[PDB]
Structure 1
Amino acid sequence: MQKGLWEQCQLLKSTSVFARCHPLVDPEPFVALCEKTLCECAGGLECACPALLEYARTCAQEGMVLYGWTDHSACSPVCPAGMEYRQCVSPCARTCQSL
């Protein structure tokens, strides 16, 4: 447990972008999970990222895509070289050799 890291978990409750999802998904379970993974943490603020990412994905499943959560937080979901992470990517992404 560390207060500075604990702020990152509290992002789920305090930040406006996540606050959109409260009517659909209660953040408290994710906050508790985030706190205990910070206890398990072996790094910096990024240890809170799995909880935030899962909360955003749960919200997207329920219907609300939290377009801005990656900018407000310090997190950056891993992507292969050269590709950007983005919410609501269309599955039919355009390859050149595609009709």
Structure 2
Amino acid sequence: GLWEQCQLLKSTSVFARCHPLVDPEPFVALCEKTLCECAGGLECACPALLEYARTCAQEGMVLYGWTDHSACSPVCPAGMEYRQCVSPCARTCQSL
């Protein structure tokens, strides 16, 4: 009942944008492997989706929807939120 979560890489529009650049087949295979290995729920899929999205970003196509077209949210520090395409030279209270 979790295998469909890996097929998001093939079925779901935000991931499907990147098929000309990154082949989903290895990442969905690895996803099915983590679904075999992992004892949790649907979150057991998420590392393969995250690494596919990061591979697409490295190939120059950011997957802005991926973390809400899916149940997968990466871990973040308290009061922060995960997002794609955070800028370098991040502004702070102390920085010119």
TM range (shorter): over 0.9
**Contiguous gaps of at least 5 residues in structure 2:** none
Partners in 1 of 2:68 and 2:29 — Cα distance?
A: 23
Identify the residue that residue 60 of structure 2 maps to in structure 1.
Answer: 63
**Contiguous gaps of at least 5 residues in structure 1:** none
Partners in 1 of 2:85 and 2:28 — Cα distance?
A: 24
Q: Shift of the alpha carbon at 1:63?
A: 0.3
Q: Secondary structure at the match of 1:72?
A: coil
Q: Shift of the alpha carbon at 1:43?
A: 0.4
Q: Shift of the alpha carbon at 1:93?
A: 1.2
Q: Secondary structure at the match of 2:67?
A: helix
1:31-82: CA deviations, max 9, x gaps?
Answer: 1000011000110000100000000000000000000101110000000000
Q: Shift of the alpha carbon at 1:91?
A: 1.3
Report how many aligned residue pairs link the two structures: 96
Q: Shift of the alpha carbon at 1:92?
A: 1.3
Partners in 1 of 2:63 and 2:56 — Cα distance?
A: 7
Q: Identity over the aligned pairs, expressed in percent?
A: 100
Q: Secondary structure at the match of 1:58?
A: helix
Bigger helix share: 1
Matched, 1:91 2:79: no
Q: Shift of the alpha carbon at 1:5?
A: 0.6
Partners in 2 of 1:44 and 1:93 — Cα distance?
A: 35
Q: Shift of the alpha carbon at 1:15?
A: 0.3
Partners in 1 of 2:27 and 2:59 — Cα distance?
A: 15
Structure 1 outlier segments of 4+, above 2 Å: none
Partners in 2 of 1:45 and 1:77 — Cα distance?
A: 14
Partners in 2 of 1:65 and 1:36 — Cα distance?
A: 25
